[PDB]
Ligand code: HEM
Ligand code: HEM
Ligand code: HEM
């Protein structure tokens with residue numbers, strides 16, 4: 009993930025505006041709701057039977073926010089997403105055994121949530137730069153599978 | 155792709171026995187036949203309308219053999235598949251624009267062809283070591299997308 | 301599958317879209333081409349520049365096809381037979397590309413339907429676009 | 442879809458398999474567990490060691506289910522309704538895992554049917570196993 013100056017420009021102007029207490033919880037609830045197999049990793053969180061069960065789960069919002077923290081780190085560190093993600097990759101691959109395809113899905117529902125929140129601000133070029141970041145994080149995370 | 159000594163043992167004993175003039179052409183014909191979208195990259199080769207058209211195409215056998223050459227190189231170079239595949243990755247990503255999912259498919263039909271040719275010799279452990287090689291080549295090839 | 305609640309969801313949301321559907325289509329295509337350059341491969345004769353009348357024109361064709369599927373949501377394979385043949389048998393479109401376009405469509409709908417893109421409708425819409433893609437690659441299977 | 446020639450292919454090849462089908466099933470499962478360790482996640486209560494009576498026993502259940510689908514190849518969604526519910530709605534099995542098991546099944550059949558695993562039957566068999574997987578994840582869609 010190299011990112012031209014205008015892409016980092018696009019990525020960075022938006023990211024700063026992003027409600028970080030919120031957007032994380034929206035991505036994860038939406039993951040669980042839209043792709044319900046992922047629920048198996050989160051059954052601890054309790055009641056996930058309905059979409060309203062899910063979005064209002066305080067554990068869902070608390071974990072979404074951790075996740076968003078990790079994205080901000082990758083944004084901070086595009087030139088070494090690998091180094092940046094070593095312990096997480098180790099976690100998700102070795103310990104948890106998550107299929108890396110679900111990293112792609114998490115990234116793509118994050119892009120939907122950003123679109124949802126920013127509307128027309130979230131133009132096609134801005135999306136295209138975000139699809140690069142998203143893919144590179146998904147890849148660093150799968151590194152330990154690699 | 156690290157490969158324990160017993161895996162490299164398994165991978166290496168088989169690979170030496172592999173009819174290199176043949177197996178390559180079988181993997182590629184089978185790719186075109188089983189996953190016909192891939193035919194779009196090979197329409198030059200001419201008549202690909204039937205499976206028998208495909209397997210008996212001299213251009214199919216000649217390209218399969220190039221491909222197998224590249225696998226032998228990755229086998230030769232597990233500790234740097236990246237370095238080993240730079241120009242090919244450049245080729246397949248930048249120039250041709252192949253979706254990396256098709257690298258996975260090519261690897262998996264190669265495993266079928268090896269199973270087909272080696273029968274019981276191609277035990278589950280031997281397959282599992284080959285699925286590692288196969289995945290690492292698919293990954294080095296997608297590097298330029300990355 | 302697609303439950304009764306999904307059918308309601310997709311119909312309501314396509315309803316909101318209304319006379320913009322073709323505009324949303326051309327935006328979706330533009331989103332796919334920029335984000336997933338590998339899809340461009342299938343459009344060598346198109347100009348893919350921001351103002352391309354070709355992207356506009358094709359974005360309507362796509363929007364109309366999806367509109368036909370919503371209208372005929374309980375008998376989609378028939379509704380879409382012709383398009384199936386064109387896409388699986390004529391153009392041999394790599395199936396992975398249907399996920400990418402559905403994703404770009406979902407993004408466009410989120411960009412435009414603040415109120416109606418709830419989690420629940422998002423799920424429905426996904427389920428609807430995967431059904432469409434199953435039918436359009438189904439000649440493959 | 443699955444043309445008439447595919448139906449003939451799959452029937453002939455399952456025919457060759459005959460009374461080994463359960464043995465091929467347990468081998469296929471063993472191939473998946475070793476090759477794709479992520480699939481193990483779904484079998485915490487199983488012992489997955491080479492001789493596991495559990496793998497043997499489950500390999501028969503899988504073989505029987507596929508046998509039921511071959512036998513009822515023109516009305517698979519019904520044949521497989523129950524299994525659909527179990528897999529999509531009860532166990533929530535990640536759909537990517539159906540590709541992995543179909544791949545391991547194809548490898549097993551190649552390991553055992555030298556003569557009958559031609560390119561053409563290989564294609565049919567693939568098309569048949571993707572149809573099975575579409576039906577078993579179809580509650581998702
Ligand atoms: C690709 C993006 C992802 C990122 C950035 C990511 C990030 C994180 C972060 C930061 C944590 C908190 C770890 C800690 O407490 O230090 C975590 C844990 C976790 N994530 Fe992910 N994750 C990702 C995707 C996924 C996916 C798709 C799943 C599966 C559905 C998954 C399952 C979990 C689970 C089970 C934990 C808790 C592990 C434990 O407590 O032992 N994650 N992730
Ligand atoms: C993952 C394994 C693959 C390997 C090891 C690989 C290897 C090769 C090799 C060695 C060549 C010959 C290049 C040369 O002449 O120096 C080549 C070219 C080519 N391959 Fe691949 N390839 C792979 C997968 C694929 C896939 C799945 C497709 C798409 C269906 C593809 C499409 C082609 C085409 C179009 C060329 C010719 C390029 C040209 O002449 O400009 N390859 N590949
Ligand atoms: C959501 C599923 C899709 C629908 C609704 C759809 C619909 C359409 C429609 C309505 C046409 C015109 C057919 C005619 O009347 O002759 C078309 C053509 C075509 N589509 Fe799709 N499409 C979709 C997915 C794809 C994808 C994923 C690709 C490629 C990335 C693709 C590649 C093509 C090609 C290249 C043509 C011919 C273009 C031309 O020559 O004008 N389509 N599509």
Ligand code: HEM
Pocket residue numbers: 480483484502503506507524527528532534538539542543573574577
């Ligand atoms: C080719 C498609 C598959 C078929 C034919 C199939 C068939 C079966 C059958 C017949 C059962 C027993 C159901 C019952 O009678 O109660 C079963 C159970 C189960 N399957 Fe599958 N299966 C397939 C794919 C998958 C995959 C891909 C996974 C996971 C990697 C999976 C995970 C499960 C789980 C964990 C159970 C319950 C195990 C237990 O508690 O005994 N299945 N499968």
